[PDB]
Amino acid sequence: SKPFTLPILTLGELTNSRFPLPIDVLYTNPNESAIVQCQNGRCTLDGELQGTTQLLPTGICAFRGKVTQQVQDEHRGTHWNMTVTNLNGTPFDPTEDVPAPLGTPDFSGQIYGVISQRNTNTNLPANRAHEAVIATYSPKFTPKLGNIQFSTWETQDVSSGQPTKFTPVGLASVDANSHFDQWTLPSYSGALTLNMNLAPSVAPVFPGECLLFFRSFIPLKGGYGNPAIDCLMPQEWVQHLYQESAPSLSDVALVRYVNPETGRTLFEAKLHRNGFLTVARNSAGPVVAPTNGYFRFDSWVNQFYTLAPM
Amino acid sequence: SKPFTLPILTLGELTNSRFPLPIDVLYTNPNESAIVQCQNGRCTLDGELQGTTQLLPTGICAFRGKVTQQVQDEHRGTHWNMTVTNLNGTPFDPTEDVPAPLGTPDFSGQIYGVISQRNTNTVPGEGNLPANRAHEAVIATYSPKFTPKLGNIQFSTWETQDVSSGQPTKFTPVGLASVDANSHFDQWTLPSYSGALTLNMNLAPSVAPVFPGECLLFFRSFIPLKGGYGNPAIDCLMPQEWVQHLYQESAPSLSDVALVRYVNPETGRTLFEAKLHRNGFLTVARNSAGPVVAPTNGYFRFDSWVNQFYTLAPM
Ligand SMILES: C[C@@H]1O[C@@H](O[C@H]2[C@H](O[C@H]3[C@H](O)[C@@H](O)[C@@H](O)O[C@@H]3CO)O[C@H](CO)[C@H](O)[C@@H]2O)[C@@H](O)[C@H](O)[C@@H]1O
Ligand SMILES: C[C@@H]1O[C@@H](O[C@H]2[C@H](O[C@H]3[C@H](O)[C@@H](O)[C@@H](O)O[C@@H]3CO)O[C@H](CO)[C@H](O)[C@@H]2O)[C@@H](O)[C@H](O)[C@@H]1O
Ligand SMILES: C[C@@H]1O[C@@H](O[C@H]2[C@H](O[C@H]3[C@H](O)[C@@H](O)[C@@H](O)O[C@@H]3CO)O[C@H](CO)[C@H](O)[C@@H]2O)[C@@H](O)[C@H](O)[C@@H]1O
């Protein structure tokens, strides 16, 4: 039976699985009232990708497809409808058992990035790129139906019928009108439809335990704020688990966060079969620990194992 | 000790180590006249990172630092100086034995992206939160003001005023501004990391085939353009996932060359074989330039270490 392992990457060698950002800090928030059910960065410990999770760091919150035409919308700016394909360019099949094309954003907000186009016709093709926003809460955000809408400040220089890429950069705003909520899923098929094929929600099941996240701070195009995106496992863990596909020998792996410059354990955590961490902590905020620390798998344990308090 | 391995990732599950892009195609160009000496995506088969290579996909062609002031420049646009730190926020020590801060671009061109800032000072009237701004920006890596090894670079914006001095600044790369004649895109020309007239140091070595009939094999990605005509590409010697894997495993190299097979897992047939050299690059026996037309679910599998007499089957 192939032994389970994690990569040996310090926090400073890890990236977020929910937006293309480095991991900045570990984080807890035991008083969170929302259901935690993100769809990117979801992988079981035996290597089964779930939700909208895919392997490419460049695929997270990215889209590929083609602009169809300019459209009108109450949002400020100039608006464009885009069909979306799979990230690899093949047509997205809405009958596949996924919530939306892999890589689709898994949160409500105004995602800021760059739309770029390289024309099919040429002898070299013409190109353009412009800043763009995708409001994932909009009724026109229908990636599971194969099309979305983005806005630009640019008033006309977006071509219809030409290959189009969205490169995410950050958020447009976090003011009240921009509806940023990292735990609110988009409605992938539109306003009044039920999302399907979701990766399950995650939660601690033992008193005294809370979720532990890998937190990244996300850029803003304007306004005030210090927004963050919390993932359950970094993208390199998704990639590693997918590769190894080690059988899970219990429902809970005990892992130790170790300072290698001393071999000392700073704290311990439970890494659950569905791909998330809990710790024994009764406070919210960052975990203050050196970023050369890393998680080391020590043994499979019973669900009723009591974690040493942080 | 540890057997050598490569990850099991198809072409469509790989990303470029020299720019944040998926791998699009395998590619050869036997007649290339330039010295191939890129500095990102450089890792020996026993896991030694070289050049300016680091592990984060988000770090490739990224910068972190602080805008110091607006500056004068003869070229069109508004120009800004920024100091750069290490990507982890610690001060860059110019005496370290690297060519430049890890992640620094390794080619000549106008790199297009977004500069974003999150202020250090917070506003009580805004909930004790900082002000933010982001704008499109271009970094001309051939400019005499591109001096990352000295701890600072210059970028240009279309925006004429709304970039703040003294505030934390991030550059997120997106593509190239142009590949017209005046934009000096050449993927094999290194920047002068310490400026005009200085010699670059601590470089990862150049790579080349040493056997007749062999040419380098690259993992090629097409890079976006802000404007103009072109279909520019960036070729890396190994994808970022291979850098990450080799660094983790640190498997001893048992010869100078690992024979690898590009396999189609559906049929289990080998499509071609290649030499994976100790310093971290591939060669194939091919006498043409252009893409390697193969399924994107194919992948390289380590076969065995080979000696200096092994001749590759032609593609
Ligand atoms: C705080 C400043 O933000 C930018 O100011 C621009 C301003 O941004 C607003 C956002 O667009 C809006 O969603 C909300 O978040 O409030 C922001 C202002 O607080 O938008 C106007 C146009 O309406 C201008 O573009 C302002 O420049 C940034 O540009 C400033 O430097 C400040 O950081
Ligand atoms: C940072 C420099 O930017 C350009 O020169 C600008 C010049 O910078 C001066 C600094 O302000 C000063 O602290 C000291 O370092 O001398 C610098 C060079 O004179 O400031 C003027 C102000 O009008 C212009 O903005 C210059 O463009 C660049 O040319 C230099 O090489 C430095 O990188
Ligand atoms: C081919 C068209 O490119 C863009 O046109 C914009 C134009 O881009 C020029 C680049 O700035 C220049 O480096 C060189 O590459 O030529 C390009 C034009 O071919 O720049 C002007 C401003 O000077 C306008 O912004 C043009 O719109 C693109 O916007 C067009 O849709 C075409 O693809």
XYZ file of C-alpha atoms and ligand atoms in Angstrom:
724
model
C 0.000 0.000 0.000
C 1.612 3.187 -1.287
C 2.513 5.402 1.694
C 0.847 8.788 1.974
C 3.055 11.861 1.746
C 2.863 15.630 1.452
C 5.379 17.793 -0.418
C 8.148 19.458 1.575
C 7.331 23.086 0.792
C 7.533 25.943 3.194
C 4.727 28.479 3.228
C 6.924 30.675 1.058
C 7.036 27.929 -1.586
C 3.236 27.425 -1.796
C 0.538 29.069 -3.906
C -3.212 29.500 -3.427
C -5.525 27.039 -5.161
C -8.436 29.524 -5.407
C -6.638 32.518 -6.972
C -3.117 32.859 -8.576
C -1.385 34.214 -5.490
C 1.367 33.083 -3.145
C 0.361 31.869 0.293
C 0.953 34.678 2.773
C -0.082 33.220 6.151
C -1.950 30.391 7.826
C -5.305 31.531 9.236
C -8.239 30.457 11.410
C -11.717 31.903 11.997
C -13.728 29.643 14.302
C -16.735 31.998 14.391
C -17.332 31.877 10.618
C -21.072 31.626 10.027
C -20.961 30.742 6.332
C -20.903 27.225 4.968
C -17.388 26.555 3.663
C -17.827 24.870 0.297
C -15.283 26.279 -2.123
C -14.881 24.451 -5.429
C -11.266 25.197 -6.440
C -8.455 23.609 -4.456
C -10.577 20.524 -3.710
C -8.817 17.158 -3.758
C -9.227 14.079 -1.597
C -6.161 12.658 0.092
C -6.170 9.746 -2.348
C -5.972 12.064 -5.351
C -9.538 12.640 -6.570
C -10.019 16.198 -7.836
C -13.435 17.610 -6.970
C -15.535 20.618 -7.766
C -14.073 22.823 -10.496
C -10.500 21.936 -9.485
C -7.851 21.463 -12.165
C -4.090 21.211 -12.007
C -2.727 24.313 -13.746
C -1.827 27.303 -11.588
C -2.563 29.340 -14.729
C -6.064 27.844 -14.892
C -7.385 29.143 -11.565
C -10.044 31.838 -12.234
C -9.027 31.850 -15.911
C -11.307 31.604 -18.930
C -10.761 30.770 -22.587
C -13.305 31.230 -25.343
C -14.555 33.771 -27.870
C -16.338 37.096 -27.710
C -19.701 36.929 -29.477
C -20.827 40.558 -29.373
C -21.049 43.705 -27.303
C -24.059 43.683 -24.955
C -25.793 46.098 -22.619
C -25.867 45.861 -18.820
C -26.797 48.102 -15.888
C -23.199 47.839 -14.582
C -20.901 50.728 -15.416
C -18.690 50.299 -18.469
C -18.804 48.469 -21.789
C -19.962 44.878 -21.794
C -19.115 41.814 -23.811
C -20.547 38.348 -24.045
C -18.025 35.548 -24.251
C -18.579 31.894 -24.931
C -16.273 29.751 -22.816
C -14.576 26.466 -23.659
C -12.600 24.119 -21.478
C -9.241 25.639 -20.649
C -7.596 23.214 -23.098
C -9.706 24.632 -25.933
C -12.099 21.730 -26.344
C -15.816 22.577 -26.291
C -17.301 22.622 -22.826
C -19.913 19.868 -22.525
C -22.633 20.964 -20.051
C -23.595 17.303 -19.492
C -20.258 16.499 -17.820
C -20.546 15.949 -14.065
C -18.842 19.163 -12.971
C -20.328 22.378 -11.558
C -18.829 24.495 -14.355
C -15.705 24.437 -16.564
C -12.674 23.581 -14.496
C -10.959 26.694 -13.182
C -14.148 28.787 -13.058
C -14.090 31.156 -10.043
C -15.781 29.762 -6.929
C -16.755 33.012 -5.162
C -18.983 36.066 -5.488
C -17.195 39.241 -6.470
C -15.964 41.522 -9.226
C -12.870 39.722 -10.521
C -10.391 42.108 -12.173
C -7.979 40.952 -14.815
C -6.946 41.337 -18.437
C -8.813 40.105 -21.513
C -6.500 39.394 -24.440
C -7.205 38.325 -27.989
C -5.091 36.912 -30.794
C -7.005 36.817 -34.049
C -7.482 33.627 -36.038
C -7.064 35.310 -39.419
C -3.757 36.728 -40.633
C 1.127 36.922 -42.337
C 0.691 37.537 -38.597
C -2.483 37.960 -36.513
C -3.650 41.157 -34.865
C -3.846 41.311 -31.072
C -5.319 43.446 -28.308
C -5.620 43.311 -24.524
C -7.580 45.441 -22.039
C -8.405 45.488 -18.353
C -11.673 43.693 -17.646
C -14.046 42.786 -14.829
C -16.203 39.665 -14.394
C -19.056 40.013 -11.885
C -19.516 36.426 -10.793
C -22.819 37.243 -9.012
C -24.379 38.625 -12.173
C -27.258 36.765 -13.849
C -25.105 36.849 -16.986
C -22.376 34.788 -15.263
C -23.496 31.403 -16.673
C -20.288 29.399 -17.193
C -22.092 26.053 -16.817
C -24.213 27.132 -19.808
C -21.017 27.944 -21.716
C -20.988 31.735 -21.658
C -20.118 34.645 -19.393
C -20.045 38.447 -19.606
C -17.190 40.820 -18.845
C -16.946 44.591 -18.712
C -14.152 46.869 -19.899
C -13.250 50.489 -19.460
C -12.206 50.290 -23.122
C -15.180 51.421 -25.184
C -14.758 49.576 -28.460
C -11.479 47.692 -29.069
C -12.737 44.152 -28.378
C -13.268 41.991 -31.453
C -16.124 39.560 -31.943
C -15.457 36.002 -33.040
C -11.813 35.998 -32.008
C -10.020 33.757 -29.481
C -10.092 35.399 -26.074
C -8.272 34.719 -22.790
C -8.996 36.111 -19.324
C -5.945 36.408 -17.049
C -7.060 37.095 -13.459
C -5.210 39.754 -11.456
C -7.357 40.634 -8.432
C -10.658 42.255 -7.483
C -12.166 45.433 -8.890
C -13.473 46.641 -5.515
C -14.703 45.319 -2.198
C -17.267 48.029 -1.550
C -20.859 47.049 -0.751
C -21.947 47.287 -4.396
C -19.300 44.784 -5.512
C -20.606 41.817 -3.507
C -17.312 40.206 -2.526
C -17.909 37.111 -0.395
C -15.358 34.344 -0.680
C -17.773 31.706 0.690
C -20.769 32.547 -1.535
C -20.687 30.351 -4.624
C -21.676 31.815 -7.982
C -24.852 30.424 -9.538
C -23.032 28.632 -12.326
C -26.142 28.219 -14.521
C -27.856 31.487 -13.626
C -29.878 33.257 -11.009
C -32.568 30.785 -9.945
C -30.833 27.474 -10.693
C -29.295 24.997 -8.263
C -25.578 24.334 -8.602
C -24.715 20.678 -9.104
C -21.827 18.239 -8.806
C -20.344 20.295 -5.987
C -17.461 19.276 -3.818
C -18.903 18.843 -0.315
C -18.861 21.423 2.436
C -16.147 21.124 5.076
C -16.334 21.683 8.804
C -14.792 20.546 12.088
C -16.699 17.753 13.816
C -14.893 17.731 17.186
C -15.320 20.373 19.906
C -12.444 22.809 20.170
C -11.440 22.325 16.533
C -11.624 24.890 13.745
C -10.651 24.934 10.081
C -7.121 26.004 9.213
C -6.680 27.881 5.939
C -3.855 28.933 3.628
C -4.540 32.653 3.211
C -3.488 34.974 0.412
C -4.076 38.695 0.070
C -5.607 39.653 -3.266
C -4.914 42.873 -5.211
C -7.489 45.635 -5.686
C -8.008 47.890 -8.700
C -9.335 50.660 -6.425
C -10.902 51.663 -3.176
C -10.197 50.683 0.402
C -9.638 47.191 1.709
C -7.235 44.326 2.351
C -9.166 41.389 0.878
C -8.032 37.821 1.375
C -8.792 34.458 -0.234
C -8.539 31.347 1.998
C -7.907 27.936 0.470
C -8.177 24.535 2.154
C -4.971 23.192 0.583
C -2.430 24.966 -1.617
C -2.222 24.191 -5.295
C 0.993 22.214 -4.862
C -0.786 19.834 -2.481
C -3.534 19.298 -5.042
C -0.852 18.522 -7.624
C 1.027 16.190 -5.276
C -2.015 14.234 -4.097
C -3.226 13.802 -7.666
C 0.181 12.393 -8.667
C 0.605 10.023 -5.738
C -2.959 8.725 -5.381
C -1.964 7.032 -2.115
C -4.818 5.089 -0.494
C -6.301 6.750 2.579
C -5.831 4.348 5.504
C -8.120 6.238 7.865
C -10.335 9.315 7.629
C -7.728 11.549 9.324
C -3.988 12.050 8.746
C -2.049 13.590 11.633
C 0.406 16.197 10.382
C 2.945 18.267 12.275
C 4.028 21.783 11.333
C 7.776 21.590 11.868
C 10.574 24.142 12.015
C 13.394 22.331 10.174
C 16.053 24.736 11.487
C 15.406 22.984 14.830
C 13.317 19.859 14.188
C 10.799 21.216 16.696
C 7.074 20.785 16.123
C 5.277 24.115 16.294
C 1.773 22.623 16.309
C -0.171 19.665 14.976
C -3.246 19.419 12.784
C -5.696 16.906 11.369
C -5.667 16.559 7.577
C -9.053 15.114 6.680
C -9.786 12.609 3.931
C -11.817 15.096 1.898
C -8.837 17.464 1.770
C -8.897 20.051 4.540
C -7.207 20.806 7.853
C -8.432 21.362 11.394
C -6.530 22.537 14.465
C -7.306 22.876 18.169
C -7.467 26.668 18.421
C -10.021 29.032 19.923
C -9.053 32.278 18.255
C -9.302 33.910 14.843
C -6.436 35.437 12.935
C -3.047 34.514 11.545
C -0.853 31.743 12.819
C 2.391 33.511 13.719
C 5.086 31.068 12.632
C 8.202 31.300 10.453
C 7.520 30.753 6.761
C 10.221 28.065 6.458
C 7.943 25.805 8.480
C 6.141 23.011 6.680
C 3.637 20.226 7.325
C 5.005 16.695 7.762
C 2.755 13.636 7.682
C 3.291 11.567 10.800
C 0.553 8.930 10.958
C -2.988 7.947 10.118
C -5.083 8.415 13.246
C -8.548 7.725 14.549
C -11.289 10.314 14.138
C -11.443 10.705 17.938
C -7.771 11.662 18.207
C -7.479 14.783 20.373
C -5.166 17.416 18.914
C -2.643 19.148 21.128
C -3.934 22.720 21.531
C -2.164 25.352 19.475
C 19.650 6.148 -3.221
C 16.350 7.492 -4.530
C 15.435 6.387 -8.065
C 14.993 9.274 -10.475
C 11.431 10.038 -11.563
C 9.479 12.590 -13.505
C 5.935 13.657 -12.646
C 3.114 11.991 -14.573
C 1.616 15.093 -16.146
C 0.435 15.416 -19.672
C 1.276 18.416 -21.797
C -2.113 19.849 -20.891
C -1.276 19.617 -17.170
C 2.025 21.536 -17.444
C 2.958 25.208 -17.185
C 5.862 27.237 -18.541
C 8.773 27.992 -16.191
C 9.732 31.259 -17.948
C 6.328 33.011 -18.051
C 2.981 32.233 -16.333
C 1.420 30.326 -19.222
C 0.224 26.785 -19.870
C 2.392 24.648 -22.100
C 0.884 24.704 -25.594
C 3.162 22.447 -27.680
C 6.532 20.747 -27.820
C 8.882 22.452 -30.249
C 12.248 22.238 -31.968
C 14.387 24.719 -33.897
C 17.672 23.090 -34.918
C 18.944 26.103 -36.851
C 18.760 28.504 -33.899
C 21.823 30.736 -33.981
C 21.470 32.239 -30.501
C 23.096 30.866 -27.389
C 20.378 29.248 -25.295
C 21.020 30.387 -21.736
C 17.679 31.178 -20.094
C 17.740 31.696 -16.332
C 14.206 30.773 -15.244
C 13.186 27.150 -15.427
C 16.738 25.991 -14.653
C 17.142 22.983 -12.361
C 19.581 20.099 -12.427
C 18.188 16.585 -12.461
C 19.334 16.150 -8.830
C 17.272 19.170 -7.789
C 19.665 22.144 -7.753
C 17.889 25.334 -8.832
C 20.037 27.617 -10.972
C 19.922 31.095 -12.473
C 16.996 33.138 -11.183
C 14.741 30.082 -10.840
C 12.349 29.821 -7.914
C 9.485 27.495 -7.181
C 6.352 29.649 -7.243
C 4.348 29.810 -10.473
C 3.225 33.254 -9.285
C 6.842 34.383 -8.978
C 7.879 33.975 -12.610
C 8.409 37.440 -14.149
C 6.868 38.995 -11.017
C 8.290 41.786 -8.889
C 7.569 43.062 -5.402
C 8.850 46.339 -4.058
C 7.956 50.025 -3.628
C 7.562 52.894 -6.079
C 10.070 55.584 -5.139
C 9.215 58.390 -7.602
C 8.068 59.314 -11.071
C 11.067 59.557 -13.405
C 11.974 61.078 -16.739
C 12.411 58.945 -19.830
C 12.587 59.800 -23.519
C 10.017 57.146 -24.449
C 6.265 57.624 -24.677
C 4.269 57.238 -21.487
C 4.651 57.934 -17.789
C 7.625 56.352 -16.068
C 8.229 55.237 -12.498
C 11.131 53.863 -10.504
C 10.499 51.048 -8.065
C 12.847 49.353 -5.684
C 12.536 45.578 -5.709
C 12.837 43.140 -2.822
C 12.904 39.382 -2.816
C 9.480 37.983 -3.696
C 9.045 36.959 -0.038
C 9.339 40.624 0.999
C 12.809 40.405 2.536
C 15.478 42.815 1.283
C 17.350 41.714 -1.807
C 21.027 41.293 -0.955
C 23.014 42.180 -4.117
C 25.984 40.170 -2.785
C 24.070 36.880 -3.008
C 25.376 34.538 -5.721
C 22.395 34.948 -8.039
C 22.068 36.933 -11.270
C 19.162 39.011 -9.948
C 16.226 38.508 -7.550
C 14.676 35.127 -8.170
C 11.789 35.367 -10.643
C 13.284 38.311 -12.555
C 12.468 38.046 -16.296
C 15.221 36.306 -18.276
C 14.653 37.863 -21.703
C 14.701 41.098 -23.657
C 11.301 42.624 -24.309
C 8.477 44.899 -23.187
C 6.740 42.862 -20.507
C 3.096 43.912 -20.107
C 1.218 43.414 -16.860
C -0.504 45.146 -13.983
C 1.096 47.180 -11.226
C -0.986 47.127 -8.034
C -0.489 48.888 -4.718
C -1.925 48.418 -1.245
C -0.954 51.319 0.979
C 0.830 50.834 4.293
C -1.106 53.619 6.020
C -4.740 52.964 6.880
C -7.688 55.349 7.124
C -9.785 55.248 10.331
C -12.774 56.640 8.400
C -12.583 53.657 6.033
C -12.568 51.024 8.767
C -8.811 51.223 9.381
C -8.218 49.898 5.882
C -5.707 50.925 3.223
C -6.240 52.582 -0.129
C -5.478 50.634 -3.304
C -4.883 51.173 -7.010
C -3.884 49.118 -10.025
C -2.927 50.070 -13.586
C -1.532 48.471 -16.719
C 2.220 48.775 -16.914
C 5.178 47.826 -19.094
C 8.714 46.834 -18.055
C 11.323 47.187 -20.824
C 13.894 44.635 -19.719
C 16.449 45.949 -22.255
C 16.349 49.467 -20.841
C 19.479 50.767 -19.094
C 17.152 51.496 -16.197
C 16.268 47.783 -15.783
C 18.734 47.117 -12.947
C 17.136 44.430 -10.742
C 20.513 43.157 -9.488
C 21.050 46.665 -8.085
C 17.636 46.502 -6.420
C 15.489 48.699 -8.659
C 13.665 48.751 -11.983
C 11.621 51.184 -14.046
C 8.148 50.618 -15.461
C 5.873 52.706 -17.647
C 2.125 53.292 -17.467
C -0.548 54.772 -19.666
C -1.999 56.274 -16.480
C -0.340 59.638 -15.918
C -0.818 60.327 -12.211
C -2.424 57.592 -10.056
C 0.667 55.695 -8.878
C 1.748 56.424 -5.318
C 5.327 56.871 -4.127
C 6.420 55.049 -0.998
C 3.762 52.357 -1.142
C 4.010 48.566 -1.496
C 3.803 47.603 -5.159
C 3.335 44.311 -7.001
C 3.860 43.582 -10.690
C 1.672 40.780 -12.095
C 2.887 39.766 -15.571
C 0.311 39.231 -18.333
C 2.165 39.186 -21.645
C 4.124 41.449 -23.974
C 3.333 45.024 -24.945
C 4.400 44.645 -28.588
C 6.759 42.620 -30.766
C 7.332 45.373 -33.321
C 10.876 46.296 -34.281
C 11.261 48.971 -31.620
C 10.195 46.648 -28.784
C 13.282 44.386 -28.866
C 11.637 41.069 -28.074
C 14.254 38.305 -28.162
C 13.628 35.378 -25.855
C 17.282 34.297 -25.893
C 18.842 37.723 -25.162
C 19.364 38.098 -21.437
C 18.754 41.443 -19.751
C 21.769 43.239 -18.326
C 20.686 42.731 -14.726
C 23.011 45.444 -13.338
C 22.582 47.833 -16.232
C 24.307 48.912 -19.365
C 27.944 47.927 -19.673
C 27.983 45.451 -16.721
C 28.619 41.730 -17.000
C 25.927 39.400 -15.729
C 27.104 36.939 -13.102
C 26.115 33.679 -11.416
C 24.373 32.504 -14.586
C 22.953 29.088 -15.220
C 25.059 27.622 -18.037
C 24.182 27.573 -21.695
C 22.631 24.377 -23.077
C 23.166 22.630 -26.409
C 23.179 19.190 -28.053
C 26.568 17.475 -28.153
C 25.667 14.639 -30.531
C 25.153 14.934 -34.302
C 21.568 14.891 -35.465
C 20.313 16.113 -32.083
C 18.552 19.370 -31.330
C 17.028 20.913 -28.220
C 13.389 20.123 -27.432
C 11.393 22.919 -25.812
C 8.087 23.263 -24.015
C 6.506 26.167 -25.888
C 3.826 28.619 -24.799
C 2.206 31.449 -26.763
C 2.315 34.735 -24.882
C -0.436 37.406 -25.011
C 0.061 40.773 -26.702
C -1.347 44.151 -25.706
C -1.370 45.288 -29.338
C 0.006 44.879 -32.800
C 0.735 41.905 -34.999
C 2.427 38.692 -34.015
C 2.159 35.283 -32.405
C 5.033 35.393 -29.907
C 6.146 32.326 -28.001
C 8.324 31.596 -24.970
C 10.215 28.275 -24.963
C 11.302 26.693 -21.672
C 13.708 23.822 -21.153
C 11.535 22.112 -18.562
C 8.073 23.020 -17.276
C 7.647 24.507 -13.826
C 6.143 21.276 -12.495
C 9.376 19.496 -13.360
C 11.446 22.109 -11.506
C 9.183 21.634 -8.512
C 9.411 17.836 -8.718
C 13.189 17.617 -9.177
C 13.717 20.038 -6.306
C 11.544 17.874 -4.014
C 13.032 14.533 -4.956
C 16.724 15.473 -5.131
C 17.423 12.067 -6.689
C 21.117 11.381 -7.440
C 21.991 11.502 -11.129
C 23.546 8.157 -12.047
C 24.842 9.310 -15.440
C 24.995 12.481 -17.506
C 21.862 11.539 -19.497
C 18.467 10.060 -18.602
C 16.672 8.377 -21.489
C 12.994 9.326 -21.458
C 10.117 8.103 -23.625
C 7.135 10.215 -24.677
C 4.279 7.765 -24.150
C 0.630 7.721 -25.152
C -1.064 6.105 -22.123
C -4.134 5.076 -24.156
C -2.154 2.711 -26.398
C 0.905 2.573 -24.129
C 2.962 3.137 -27.279
C 6.116 5.243 -27.255
C 5.829 8.131 -29.701
C 9.492 9.168 -29.563
C 12.424 9.159 -27.191
C 14.579 11.958 -25.862
C 17.698 12.564 -23.815
C 17.144 14.425 -20.541
C 20.519 15.921 -19.683
C 21.928 16.289 -16.172
C 21.836 20.113 -16.287
C 18.099 20.043 -17.013
C 17.181 20.101 -20.714
C 16.053 17.716 -23.447
C 17.412 16.782 -26.862
C 15.786 14.732 -29.625
C 17.003 13.318 -32.935
C 15.066 15.595 -35.276
C 16.132 17.577 -38.338
C 13.146 19.918 -38.627
C 11.862 22.995 -36.842
C 8.306 23.456 -35.658
C 5.812 21.864 -33.306
C 5.866 18.225 -32.334
C 2.402 17.047 -33.357
C 1.351 14.618 -30.626
C -1.607 14.063 -28.293
C -1.735 16.401 -25.306
C -2.443 13.397 -23.041
C 1.052 12.098 -23.841
C 3.770 12.366 -21.218
C 7.473 11.721 -20.667
C 8.394 8.563 -18.738
C 11.855 7.902 -17.336
C 13.315 4.735 -18.879
C 16.922 4.467 -17.678
C 20.234 6.255 -17.297
C 22.338 5.891 -20.447
C 26.010 6.300 -21.266
C 27.793 8.615 -23.711
C 27.358 6.165 -26.621
C 23.558 6.020 -26.766
C 22.044 7.104 -30.090
C 18.418 8.235 -30.102
C 15.853 6.763 -32.446
C 14.932 9.558 -34.884
C 11.498 11.073 -34.328
C -9.185 54.818 -2.728
C -8.776 55.295 -4.113
O -9.189 54.261 -5.064
C -9.004 54.633 -6.409
O -9.772 55.838 -6.706
C -10.504 55.752 -7.883
C -12.000 55.487 -7.572
O -12.070 54.161 -7.003
C -13.305 53.836 -6.366
C -13.731 52.454 -6.809
O -13.859 52.453 -8.214
C -15.067 52.123 -6.181
O -15.476 50.810 -6.548
C -14.951 52.174 -4.678
O -14.116 51.113 -4.244
O -14.404 53.423 -4.291
C -13.159 53.772 -4.868
C -12.780 55.119 -4.298
O -12.661 54.965 -2.897
O -12.748 55.587 -8.760
C -12.651 56.879 -9.417
C -13.598 56.771 -10.606
O -14.919 56.671 -10.142
C -11.244 57.199 -9.827
O -10.847 56.262 -10.794
C -10.337 57.113 -8.583
O -9.002 57.302 -8.985
C -7.526 54.927 -6.733
O -7.393 55.370 -8.041
C -6.990 56.029 -5.724
O -5.564 56.179 -5.874
C -7.275 55.645 -4.264
O -6.481 54.509 -3.899
C 15.880 56.813 -9.180
C 16.559 57.481 -10.352
O 15.539 57.722 -11.322
C 15.945 58.376 -12.482
O 16.489 59.686 -12.222
C 15.494 60.631 -11.737
C 16.079 61.477 -10.598
O 16.397 60.589 -9.512
C 17.328 61.147 -8.590
C 16.813 60.849 -7.197
O 15.613 61.573 -6.958
C 17.805 61.280 -6.138
O 17.378 60.744 -4.891
C 19.185 60.744 -6.447
O 19.132 59.329 -6.321
O 19.553 61.095 -7.770
C 18.701 60.519 -8.749
C 19.311 60.780 -10.116
O 19.435 62.189 -10.318
O 15.128 62.451 -10.172
C 14.769 63.352 -11.227
C 13.828 64.376 -10.572
O 13.492 65.400 -11.527
C 14.153 62.627 -12.400
O 12.883 62.057 -11.969
C 15.135 61.546 -12.886
O 14.491 60.876 -13.956
C 17.031 57.607 -13.202
O 17.515 58.324 -14.339
C 18.192 57.344 -12.252
O 19.154 56.493 -12.896
C 17.707 56.665 -10.957
O 17.256 55.317 -11.223
C -3.152 45.483 -34.643
C -3.978 46.398 -33.727
O -3.229 46.563 -32.468
C -3.768 47.411 -31.510
O -3.847 48.769 -32.011
C -3.491 49.763 -31.078
C -2.084 50.315 -31.348
O -1.165 49.242 -31.093
C 0.089 49.419 -31.743
C 1.161 49.173 -30.707
O 1.069 50.184 -29.716
C 2.518 49.253 -31.374
O 3.500 48.826 -30.447
C 2.604 48.344 -32.585
O 2.589 46.996 -32.145
O 1.521 48.574 -33.469
C 0.244 48.426 -32.872
C -0.794 48.673 -33.946
O -0.646 47.640 -34.911
O -1.819 51.407 -30.519
C -2.753 52.511 -30.740
C -2.258 53.617 -29.844
O -1.091 54.178 -30.393
C -4.176 52.092 -30.439
O -4.272 51.793 -29.031
C -4.538 50.880 -31.267
O -5.821 50.452 -30.871
C -5.198 46.950 -31.135
O -5.795 47.865 -30.248
C -6.059 46.761 -32.424
O -7.334 46.167 -32.136
C -5.358 45.874 -33.483
O -5.270 44.497 -33.066
